[PDB]
Every structure is written in structure tokens, then in C-alpha cells.
Design a protein around this ligand. Structure first.
Ligand SMILES: Nc1nc2c(ncn2[C@@H]2O[C@H](COP(=O)(O)OP(=O)(O)O)[C@@H](OP(=O)(O)OP(=O)(O)O)[C@H]2O)c(=O)[nH]1
Ligand SMILES: Nc1nc2c(ncn2[C@@H]2O[C@H](COP(=O)(O)OP(=O)(O)O)[C@@H](OP(=O)(O)OP(=O)(O)O)[C@H]2O)c(=O)[nH]1
Ligand SMILES: Nc1nc2c(ncn2[C@@H]2O[C@H](COP(=O)(O)OP(=O)(O)O)[C@@H](OP(=O)(O)OP(=O)(O)O)[C@H]2O)c(=O)[nH]1
Ligand SMILES: Nc1ncnc2c1ncn2[C@@H]1O[C@H](COP(=O)(O)OP(=O)(O)OP(=O)(O)O)[C@@H](O)[C@H]1O
Ligand SMILES: Nc1ncnc2c1ncn2[C@@H]1O[C@H](COP(=O)(O)OP(=O)(O)OP(=O)(O)O)[C@@H](O)[C@H]1O
Ligand SMILES: Nc1ncnc2c1ncn2[C@@H]1O[C@H](COP(=O)(O)OP(=O)(O)OP(=O)(O)O)[C@@H](O)[C@H]1O
Ligand SMILES: [Mg+2]
Ligand SMILES: [Mg+2]
Ligand SMILES: [Mg+2]
Ligand SMILES: [Mg+2]
Ligand SMILES: [Mg+2]
Ligand SMILES: [Mg+2]
Lengths: 464, 464, 464, 108
């Protein structure tokens, strides 16, 4: 009658929690070559990624640059919400218009604009020119950075530097082959698109073709623009932020909380699903049990994020005593979400590509990457050089001494993190590990990897 | 109903994997003295070793020298395939002609051969002379290294240095006693063997008797030549390699793959078994489960090799998340192989002789030794002297500065491995540990050791 | 002819530099008890301290609180200049009015002042009440914190809470004994001082007597107010800052530069000496040679500060390769300053009280303490509790999640420094060490300690 | 700065520039860090462990980044030395004086 671990209640200790280090993938019959394995997976019930990886929406991980890089790599990025609503909406706009985003609503300047303003717009959107539209609304010309390369006077108006009409243009609904043919024939890099009245409706640049060739796995929406997600909280400021982000063109809204088994979080999810659910996917916060995942599914979430204190040495585990091992948590969440076809996102605890393979085999559909991507080039922060090494830092007015020691050392030296380089190499290494796991387990797709079996190892299997 | 580790499927976590550190051998009733225990075991269904150890077929472990040493020690060597087909066939031929291999097809030279060519052949085959056969095909004499010891001019032909006929010869089918008596009577070290018509058919040297007395446990084929195995891959190049190796006289072909539960590997095994299966034994690649071992047995493999990611901190376990603890894998593989009499080779994860005893007690017939033999003298590599120690390395044209620092330090200092000495001492230590285990468990033979019992130990049993 | 260290110029290597670890103080004939040694010394040619220690004028060391504590301990503090001119002048005013500073120019309030503003003034000046003066200029009452202890409504005007006139007052020029007698007789803690016409001229509080009894070594000016110094740079902003500080009531101005052997620094020192030299003492920046000290003396400096890269592992020594060992630098600076009676301040390189004794025996008159005082309670920074220990830190809007991990850890954990406790204990330990040194060397005064002899030790004397 | 003050006119830089982007060698990514390496035919197995690790992981050196940043840091240190010694030109820095320190001056 007594429980072997103490007491009389057999459900006081609910279960035995397994972490990533407790299990290994068992080899199975395999006709799968790692180079031909298909790693595409569902992020939500309507969005499918070519690479099942998402950035972690932390202030040190994901901004517009990281979102663009992740969308190009085949995954997606989620913008963090530790900033004003206007800044987050502007970052969403930057991601949406980065690549093949000027086809329908192009950015234009006026003939009275100075060269500095045009250069600022070009630097923000990473484009090399803009069409010029006057007060009447007529396409009067185009101004590119070949026109303003050597202009010393940056206060000069656009009208003195632009290339006047007529321009080489295309009709609405012009195919990519015809546009490329025009660009090759006239040896230009830009092609405005006008309607029957000769009024500007879009712009095609050589950047579109270059990026399509260079990044064949890019994640795009129906209009051909890069996908991006954004995080929101709970409350009224959260509602205003979510509405502003939806207006800016976000594709995924993540109700990001540490403990989503709360009435407020579920109410926010239901409200968002009812208000903008026809346009935007809604992802629920972090839930580590089956009941919480079922509650989020009932509230109408399109995807469920799992991790609640998954790290072994974690602040939640030490200060609060609350936690859940990640493998068991994913298993329970999948046991609640799978009958309704709701994807599961693993979040936290991942240190290697083997952990990603284990998380996907436990039943999750995507994995969210945090500290793995913190030091990359596309992550926020400034690159500094200290003691013969590169670091990334997150860094005078009254110190006018030219020979002071603070002048001899770089700024931001305190609080720096190692520099990891480009994001593409990290993503490629992770994808190679995942493909090796798929080849070992005989999984042609991720949906077949989700049916792979585990072997539990003892402590002796973790010894150096 | 719910699984205690998570989810609803009770087969998601298939089993608990035990490694070598998790178990110990239980003493049983024993009348066995370690000095008299019989350690002979089956390598395949037709080949029996006196010492149940095999080399690992890695480019840093097994070449012709290691194969010869392992065969003399009582085990066998498997040649690595990271080299051209002609080179691997040449190494097979070198092993096959090292000891008592000239009795039926001796190596011969011609009077037109220079002394340099004869010296090269003698250095390759480790013989001290050759019979001489002219264009017409008569045995005209013998050339040994006592004849060419002081010849300063190495371009001198054989005819100017050889000892002319008549020679002391013996008839075909001469017993060892008669040949030794002739050698003792005439006080020579070589004895050609001729047919009734006086044509050369073989050669006996004192090396045969010396090696027979020195190495009583040598592994030999039907003709008394040393046993050797070779590794092949999968594909058309692999088929050509296998055919060339069989022509060279290989005894065992090992289809060495990382994951043998693949249709291509099984097809290769079946093709080899149908083509050269009447002459050569075929060993399947590495398999960690019962189903894979059963598939290899059905395909026609003569032996099954097991280890798939057996190391605790392993590249397969960290990058792909795939692995299987070795004790459980051996148990499952034996559960599939034993009813058909197919031997099991335990490959990987062995660090001590206790691990070898545990692997043999788990049901395996032989153990394959890897990094334990990487630094021995017979392993490939160059011996260097660095900082008062001996190391083995795996290592000018435009650096003509005679006082440069690169002249002051040995080449290959970077990337060296410790030197281990002769292989025989290592094999003797491992065999002594195995004999002690056999004495403790009361096992007169390896087949009785395979019925020994284990005790599972906790984490506290591994603490220093 | 050649120099043994290289070259032909015997002055290329000018001298051998001795640091603190290279020398020890030799015991001499002593009739001195450590408890009776006199540690008073000259800071400048007109200012004498009771304890020859000065705070280091760094933004982590000296602000108004540290300056007050240092003045009470018997030394002095120099306010850092890494802040706006108005803030530094406010800190000067706070220090000057802390203790016995209302005797001639008291802080007053008007009857229309709210209780919040009076409370803010009392908190700034560390007083427990203010006299009230109307628009006409008459002393109408006094408001103390016993009157407003339980006034929950902090917007209440002073007129509703003050103790109305007539008050217990004393005539101008009242002796301290008479004021204390009045305070004892009427059992109050405050005594306004009025002239013959009944107009408010000053204020005496029990704080004056309490602090005089508690801190008998306090450094005071002619008016009986605590001494304070401030740092200024070079330039026009520096001139405005210096004029504002002199108007605020500063006593010492320190021209704080890393390399004071510059024409700009000397010109600034000369200008300050010409303009405000009758009221304020001017101390020159850091100089490490005899010629630089002579230049500062000629420019008209009242004291000369020495240290230029005195630390063994220092940023100046590593990045620039420039430095000077502190003992030799002090010897040279004293050799240039002593004939004119200009005191020397040893700045940098001090780690123990033995180093302070060595610096004073080398000829310096005062020592400037930096990192020794960084972690004390009176130094700038905020006290935090982390992992069972007290630390000092030098430190939300959008993180509204109540269960996030940033809510679980204290703010300022990054970049924290250890807590050292009260300043008085550190000063007392250093003074005890200095007194022990004086007793060993037989020096009744610091001027006698400046004539002590050294013994030079070898490397073997520094071995553990 | 010390070498130029002793009388040398130029300095030659070796290991300080070994791992920069412009130095010879290939950039590799190992264990979350960038390295520079100075690096199959018969290993056609697709699931082998040598396929799971990059080639050249052994014998690698840390990556330093662009050369311009290193040169700028060195020149800044030299300019600080010139400002301390009062040398407007390198020829005046060659007339600077030294002070000899003892062993105690090298202890942390
Ligand atoms: N004015 C301006 N232009 C910038 C700036 N940064 C990037 N660009 C331009 O943006 C276009 C694409 O930027 P990329 O660097 O290729 O791509 P990215 O979106 O990953 O940053 C290029 O012109 P392109 O003509 O599309 O390509 P190409 O002619 O260089 O091949 C490039 O010159 C900037 O700060 N100011
Ligand atoms: N020409 C030539 N001969 C070589 C060379 N290396 C070894 N030999 C000869 O090969 C024979 C056997 O070689 P061992 O060293 O005993 O054996 P191994 O096969 O283990 O290497 C010896 O002659 P033996 O007459 O059989 O033995 P013994 O008279 O030395 O006892 C030895 O002299 C070489 O580079 N060149
Ligand atoms: N209103 C107000 N008063 C403050 C504040 N902080 C300190 N005081 C008062 O200042 C006087 C002296 O402050 P202390 O703390 O003794 O000295 P300090 O200058 O070293 O800080 C005290 O009143 P006392 O009457 O001089 O001394 P006692 O009656 O407490 O002995 C104390 O109550 C504050 O934030 N607000
Ligand atoms: N559609 C167009 N019709 C006519 N002229 C055009 C058109 N697009 C660009 N031009 C003009 O052609 C010139 C170069 O065009 P393009 O856009 O290829 O240059 P760019 O991107 O600035 O070049 P670079 O990348 O070398 O700096 C500029 O003077 C530009 O104004
Ligand atoms: N069967 C034989 N009949 C006749 N002469 C022989 C025969 N075998 C060897 N000889 C000759 O006898 C001499 C020595 O023979 P043996 O083979 O014993 O020498 P070896 O092996 O060269 O000696 P070592 O190992 O001491 O250098 C040589 O001149 C050799 O040619
Ligand atoms: N000179 C004075 N003449 C008349 N009344 C006075 C005088 N000084 C103070 N008082 C009044 O006497 C009361 C107490 O005075 P006192 O200054 O001793 O108190 P306090 O410093 O506020 O006390 P505590 O330190 O206990 O809070 C207050 O109501 C105050 O207004
Ligand atoms: Mg361009
Ligand atoms: Mg271009
Ligand atoms: Mg011989
Ligand atoms: Mg011999
Ligand atoms: Mg009081
Ligand atoms: Mg009181």
C-alpha cells in the first residue's frame, strides 16, 4: 500500500522525467541517403518550413537581420518584444520588404527629397535605388546609387541627380523570364512596373533573381515575400502591439509567456484567433504538461511551444524549484496536440544537433534555437577585437584626457560574448546532423522521424 | 495507461541500454586454472581462432605487418580499404606469402634480374633468398643474401652472384622431418622442391620451422599459410575490389559499413555469398538491433559485427543523437544470430580486458580491437623521438636554410600518438585478463563463458 | 666604451626603477610607541591633514558621501569630474554644508513650501529641520522632522506644521558652551542665531557637537566646515568648471591629467594660481620624473602628484609601453620638490599599509587611495545580495511577464564588485600599519619617517 | 613602441597576423567558434563519422578577423607612446630614454 518513494498517494510523484541526455535514437531499416533526406516540416497548421528551425525571439538573438537570414536559410525568425511597438513594427516592415517586396507596394521618393534621405532609405531596405514620384503621382524617373556615388553635396535634391523619364518599364503581371530578359537586354538592374495609365505599381530589381538563385530554400508567403513572426504579451498594450504588427504584415503571432497555463494567456489566444485568425497564425506560450497543451489547443492555438525550465542548471529550477525535463514534456504535449494536428515547437535545452534530432523524434515539429545563434554575425550587437580575438558586445562625454587608459582599450570590453560568424554555417551544420540522424533511422521525412524509437541509457553511458 | 516516462505509446522508449561499466561477471563454481583455460573461439562458421581477437581494419591499425603479427599471435587481422585496390591486393599477397607460403607457388627470379630487384623482393617478403629460373624454365641456381652481402655494385646481374646448380633439393610431398633433417645434414637454410622432371615447384626455408616453434598458435588455412581478412564497401568499385582480393587469396571479406541495416549492404552480402561464398567467408557490417542481425543472417552472412555508436562520448551520439549501448546490442544480436550458429563480433567500446571478458560473456564469439593497437610497433606509422619519449606519427624542397628552426626539431612532431611497443605483449596482457575471468566464472571454454551471468551495478559502484 | 646593456649612449637606459616590492624599511633606534606616533602631514603648502590619506577622485570611489567620510576620518576626498558641472558643484555644496555649515549661511524654507520639498532638502543635507523665513525676510518659525513625522499628506504647506515664533535663539558670536547650555536647558536640538535686529544669521544643531565628539580628527577650513577637493581638466570647459567649483566653496583644485608634463597643463595651473590662488590650492597632475616635477613647481603648483603607470600589470605598460616604478619616481619627484617645500602625493600602486609606509618614507607627504576604497559603503554604487554574499553594483519597461527568469534574479548582478563595509575600519587598519612602521623606524612624525632608510631585496625575498 | 625607441625604423609582425582573414588558410567552424586551418577519395561511406566532422579540425589556429583592425590597434598603441614621450615623429621617438625594471615589476 505505501508508495516506495514515500507517502500513500501514488500520484504525488507524477512521472519520471527524461532529458535529452537520457535517450538515444535506435538505428532502423534505412534506404535513405542523408543528402536526399527531406527536412521540411510544419511550423503551424498552414506554414511549412524547408528547415525545421526557428530563432528564439530574444533581444540578443532575433532582429530584422536575423529574421531575414533565417527566412533565407529555410527557417523563420521571431522578433522580440523588448522594444517599443513602433520599432517592432518597423522591423517587421524591414523584413517584409527586404527581398521581392517592392513588386506591389514599392517605396518611392519625391523630387524634392535630399540625397541623404534616399541614402537612408536605401541603407534600411538594402536596395540600390528608388523610383521618383511627384506630387501629381507621376513616375518622373529613377535614382540609383550609381547616380549618387560621387556626389559630395548630400543636401542636393533628388531632381538634380535622378535619371529622367522615359524609363525601361514593364506591364503589370510581367513574368520573371520577361523581366530578366529586359534587364539583360537593356543592361540595367532595375525595372519599374506600371499600369495602363503609366502609373507606378511596382519595381523589380536584380536582387530578386540573385537571392532566388543563392537561397533556393527561402520561406515566402503567397505574395513571395519573406516570412517573419513576432512575439506579444498579455494585456492591453499587448493587444495594441498585436494589432500594429498585423497591420505591418506579420505572418505569425506568438503569445510568449513563461507559463501559458493561465486564463489570461488563453483568453488572449482566443481573442487573437477571433480577430485576426483568418490572416495570421497564433502560437501559444510555453506549456510543459498534457493538460496545458490540451487547454491551448482548445483555445484555438495553431502551434504549441513546450519548454518550461528545461535546462539542468536553470534559474527556474534553483530559485523556484519548478521544471520539467524536455523529452517527457514534448511527449506529453504531443500526446495532447497530435490528434488535432497541432504542431509542437521544442524550446530550450538544445545544445547539439543530436538534441534537435531527438526533439523531432519525440514528436515535435520544429525546434527553437536560442544561445546557439547568439554570437552569429546576423544577431544584434557590435563586433569588437580584444586580445587577438573577435567578440560581440552589447554596449567620452566628460573624459577629455587624450592619454587616459580608457582611450587605450575598446569600448564594450566588459560583457562581451564570443563571435560565431555567419548564421548559414551554423544552420548547415545542424541540418547535416539532422540528415545523418534521418539516414540512420531510415526516415525519408520528418513525419517518419517522429515515429522513431528511443533507447534509454544509464549514468555509465554519460562518462567521459 | 500513461507511460511513466511520457506519452501513451509503451514502445516509444524501446529498452534500457546497458554498457560495459553497468555490469560485472558473477563468480561461479570453478575447477578451471587460468593457465589451462582454452580461449579458442569461432570467427566465422568455418574459421576458428586460438585467441578470440581481431584487428579493427582502420588505416592507423591494420596493414600487412599488423595482419601477420595478429595471425602469429593466434587471432587475425582485417586490412583497411582506404587505399587503391592494387595496394590492398598487394598487402594481401604479402601476408599470404610471409610464412610457409612458398611451398607450392614460390617466388622466383631470373639470371637477368639485378641484385637491387632481388633485394627489394626479399625485403618485401622477408625472405633471405630466391630460386633462379631462366626463360626456358629450369632451376639454374639459388641466390641468397650471404651471396650478395658484400656486393657494392647493386646493378650486378644474378648470374654473376648466384650459386649454380646442382643444388640440394627434395622431392614433392616431403615431410617436415625429412626437410629439417636435410637442412641439418647439409647445414643450409633453404631447400628447393622439384617434381619428377626436375622443375621447380616449391621452396622450404628454416623460417618455417623457426616460426612454427616460436608461434605455436598461428592461424593458418588449408595450405598452412597465414589467415588474413580484408574490408570492402558497397558499389561497383567495391565489387571489383572484392574480386581482386579474392584473386589475391583473401580468406575473409568484411562488408564494412556504419549502418548495415540497408538494402544495398544486404544485396552486396548476397552477391558475394553467391559468387565467392564457397571459398571465402563473408562478414556483415555493424548492426545494433535484433532485426538487423536477423536480416544479415537471412542474407547469408557468416558472421555479424555489432557496434553502432558504442562509445559514451561519440561523434555519432553527439552529432546525430544515434547510438546503442554495447552490452544490450550484443545481447539482442546474439538473440537473433545464435539459433543459426552465426558468430558475433563485438566492435568498439572496449578499453580493458575486463570489457573483452564481458563482451564474450554477453554472447559474442570474438572481439575487434581498435585504439588499443594504434600505437604498437606493427601498426602503420613512423617512430619518432620527442622530448625524451617515443611517439608514432603519420606524416626540405624549398627550405634550404641549414640553420632554420625546422631543421632543429623532428618532422611530424604535430599529430603524434604514444608508442606502445610490440603487439605480443598487449595481446598477452589481454589474454591473461580473459583467462582470469574464465577461471573466476568456471568456464573451461569460450562457449561456457558465453553462459555466464551478470550483476548490474549502480552509479555508486563507479565512483573513485 | 660600449655600454654593457647595449649601444654607445650611457643615458639611453636612464636608471633602474624600484617598485614597492623591491624595498623594505630598515629598523632604527626607536623611542616611539605606535599608539602615540603623530601621523599628521601636509597635503599642500597651506593644508595639513591628521591622516595622510586622500581618496582617488574616480567615479567608483569619491562622491559627496565618500568625501564627507574621508574628511571625518582625518583625511580628505577629491570629487571626480566625470559628471556635469552643476552636479559637481552641488556635491561640493553638499560636502561644505554637512557639518557646522549652517552657522553663517543657513538653509531656509518659506511658509508656502510643501512638506515634500523640506523633506528633500533635509535628506540632501542630512539635517532634521529648517528655519522658516517669509517673503519679508523675518524668522517666523522652525520646522523639524518631529513636527512632520506622521503627516501623511506631504503636500501640506510649512505654515500648517511649523512651530511658530518666538523661538529659543542666541545672539551672534555665541560660544559653543553657551549654545550647548541653551540646548540642554530647553531640551531642544536646534538653536537659531539672530543679530541685534532679530534677523536670522545662522543655525546650530546638536549634530555639530555629536560629530565633534565622534570624529576628533576631522579636517576643517577656517570657518569650521569640512574640507573637500575637486578635479578639473584642461580647456575652456575646464575653466568654467573650475570657476563654478570655486564659487561653490571648494578648497583644493586638482588639475587631473595622465601626463602633466605638457604645456597646456602648466598653463592651466598658472592661470588657476593667478586667478584663485589666494583662496584655493592648486595641485598638478601626474608626473613621474624630476624635470616634470620641477616644471610643475615653476608653474606654481601647491602640490605635485606622481604616479604614471605605477602598476606592474597595467594598461599603460602593455598598450603604450610607458611607465615608471613608483619608488624611484617618488624619489626623483621629491628631489625636485623638496627645496621649494612643495608636498608630494603618491598616487597608484598601493596595495597594503606597508606600501603606504614605504611611499611616505621615500619622501611623499600624502598617499592617494584608489581600489582600496572602491567597495566601501560610502563609495558610489548600490548594495545587492547575491548567492549569500553582499556585492556593490553600478547599474522592467517592456518585460511585463510576472514569471520570467529576469524577475527571479537581482538587478546589477553583472559587473558587481565585492562589498567592503564601512570606510572607517579600512582607514583604521591602514593607520595602524603606518603607526607600526613609524614605531619600528623610530619616527615620531611623518617628517621623520621621510628620512628613513631602505634595504633592497632580491627576487628570492619575494618567493613564497 | 619599445623597439622603435631603441633605434629600429620598422617592425616585422609574425604571429600577430597569423590568423587574420587575409592570411593564408581556410576558415572553418568548430564547436561554435571560427578557426583557420591549413589542410573522401576512398571513404565513400555516407554515414561514417568522418562525414560528421569538418576536414582540418586538427592543426587549426584561432580566427582573428580583418587585418585592418589589428593594424589600427597597434598604431593606436604606438601613437599613445608617441604622445607620452613627446615625439612628433618616429625619428624623435628613436631618441627616447628607457627605465630598467626589476623582477618585482613583472609580478601580477
Ligand atoms: N545605397 C545603399 N545601397 C546599399 C546599402 N547596403 C546594401 N545596398 C545595396 O543593396 C543591394 C542588395 O544588398 P545585398 O548586400 O546584396 O543584400 P542583403 O539584403 O543581404 O544586405 C545591392 O545593390 P544591387 O544593385 O541590388 O546589387 P549589386 O549591383 O551590388 O550586385 C547593394 O549595393 C547601403 O547602405 N546603401
Ligand atoms: N635480403 C633481405 N632479407 C631480409 C630482410 N629482412 C629480413 N630478411 C630475412 O628474412 C628472414 C626472416 O625474417 P625475420 O625478421 O626473421 O621475420 P619476420 O617475417 O617476422 O620479419 C631472415 O633470414 P633467414 O635466413 O630466414 O633467418 P636467419 O638466418 O637470420 O635466422 C632475415 O634475414 C631484408 O630487408 N632483406
Ligand atoms: N528629515 C530627514 N532627516 C534625516 C535624513 N537622514 C538623516 N537625517 C537627520 O540628519 C541628522 C544627522 O544625520 P546622521 O545620520 O546622524 O549623519 P550623517 O551626516 O553622517 O548622515 C539627524 O537628526 P539629528 O536631530 O541631528 O540627530 P538625532 O536626533 O537622530 O540624534 C537625522 O535624523 C533624512 O532622509 N530625512
Ligand atoms: N529602368 C531603368 N530605365 C532607365 N535607366 C535606368 C533604369 N534603371 C536604372 N537606370 C539607370 O542606369 C544606370 C545604372 O543602373 P543600375 O540600376 O544598373 O545601376 P546601380 O545598381 O546603381 O549600379 P552599381 O551596383 O554598379 O552601383 C543609372 O544611371 C540608373 O539611373
Ligand atoms: N639448397 C641449397 N643447395 C645449395 N646451396 C645452397 C642451398 N641453399 C643455400 N645455398 C647456398 O649456401 C650458402 C649459404 O646458404 P644459407 O641459405 O644457409 O645462407 P643465408 O641464409 O644467406 O645466411 P645468413 O642468414 O647467415 O646470411 C649460400 O651461398 C647459398 O647460395
Ligand atoms: N529653537 C527652538 N525653539 C523652539 N522650538 C524648537 C526649537 N528647536 C526645535 N523646536 C521644536 O521642538 C520640537 C522638537 O525639537 P527637536 O529639534 O529636538 O526635534 P527633532 O530633531 O525633530 O527630534 P527627533 O530627532 O527625535 O526626531 C519640534 O516641535 C521643534 O519644532
Ligand atoms: Mg546596383
Ligand atoms: Mg551591380
Ligand atoms: Mg639466412
Ligand atoms: Mg642464418
Ligand atoms: Mg533630532
Ligand atoms: Mg533626537
Amino acid at each position: 500500500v505505501p508508495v516506495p518513494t514515500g507517502g500513500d498517494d501514488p500520484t504525488k510523484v507524477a512521472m519520471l522525467g527524461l532529458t535529452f541526455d537520457d535517450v538515444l535514437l535506435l538505428p532502423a531499416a534505412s534506404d535513405v541517403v542523408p543528402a536526399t533526406a527531406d527536412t521540411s516540416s510544419q511550423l503551424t497548421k498552414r506554414i511549412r518550413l524547408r528547415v525545421p528551425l526557428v530563432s528564439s525571439a530574444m533581444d540578443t538573438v532575433t532582429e530584422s537581420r536575423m529574421a531575414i537570414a533565417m527566412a533565407r536559410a529555410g527557417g523563420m525568425g521571431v522578433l522580440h518584444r523588448n522594444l517599443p511597438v513602433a520599432e517592432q513594427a518597423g522591423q517587421v516592415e524591414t523584413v517584409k520588404r527586404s527581398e521581392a517586396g517592392m513588386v506591389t507596394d514599392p517605396v518611392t521618393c519625391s523630387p524634392d527629397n535630399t540625397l541623404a534621405e534616399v541614402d537612408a532609405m536605401c541603407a534600411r531596405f538594402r536596395i540600390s535605388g528608388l523610383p521618383v514620384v511627384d506630387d501629381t503621382g507621376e513616375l518622373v524617373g529613377i535614382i540609383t546609387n550609381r547616380d549618387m556615388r560621387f556626389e559630395v553635396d548630400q543636401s542636393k535634391p533628388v531632381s538634380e541627380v535622378m535619371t529622367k523619364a522615359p524609363l525601361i518599364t514593364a506591364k503589370e503581371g510581367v513574368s520573371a523570364e520577361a523581366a530578366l530578359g529586359l534587364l539583360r537586354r537593356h543592361k540595367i538592374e532595375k525595372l519599374p512596373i506600371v499600369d495602363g495609365h503609366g502609373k507606378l505599381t511596382g519595381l523589380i530589381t536584380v536582387k530578386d533573381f540573385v537571392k532566388t538563385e543563392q537561397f533556393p530554400l527561402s520561406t515566402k508567403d503567397s505574395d513571395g515575400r519573406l516570412l517573419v513572426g513576432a512575439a506579444v504579451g498579455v494585456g492591453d498594450d499587448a493587444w495594441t502591439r498585436a494589432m500594429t504588427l498585423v497591420d505591418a504584415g506579420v505572418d505569425v503571432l506568438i503569445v510568449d509567456t513563461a507559463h501559458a497555463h493561465n486564463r489570461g494567456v488563453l483568453d488572449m489566444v482566443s481573442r487573437l484567433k477571433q480577430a485576426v485568425g483568418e490572416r495570421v497564425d497564433v502560437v501559444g506560450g510555453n506549456v510543459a504538461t498534457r493538460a496545458a497543451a490540451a487547454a491551448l489547443v482548445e483555445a484555438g492555438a495553431d502551434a504549441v511551444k513546450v519548454g518550461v525550465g528545461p535546462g539542468s542548471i536553470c534559474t527556474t529550477r534553483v530559485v523556484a524549484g519548478v521544471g520539467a525535463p524536455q523529452i517527457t514534456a514534448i511527449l506529453e504535449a504531443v500526446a495532447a496536440c497530435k490528434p488535432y494536428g497541432v504542431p509542437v515547437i521544442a524550446d530550450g535545452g538544445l545544445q547539439y544537433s543530436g538534441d534537435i534530432a531527438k526533439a523531432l523524434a519525440a514528436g515535435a515539429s520544429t525546434a527553437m534555437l536560442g544561445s546557439l545563434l547568439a554570437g552569429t554575425a546576423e544577431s544584434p550587437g557590435e563586433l569588437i577585437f580584444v586580445n587577438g580575438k573577435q567578440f560581440k558586445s552589447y554596449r567620452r562625454y566628460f573624459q577629455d584626457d587624450v592619454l587616459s587608459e580608457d582611450k587605450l582599450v575598446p569600448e564594450g570590453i566588459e560583457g562581451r560574448v564570443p563571435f560565431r560568424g555567419p548564421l548559414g554555417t551554423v544552420i548547415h551544420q545542424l541540418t547535416g546532423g539532422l540528415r545523418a540522424a534521418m539516414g540512420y533511422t531510415g526516415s525519408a521525412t520528418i513525419e517518419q522521424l517522429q515515429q522513431a524509437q528511443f533507447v534509454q541509457i544509464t549514468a555509465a553511458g554519460l562518462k567521459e
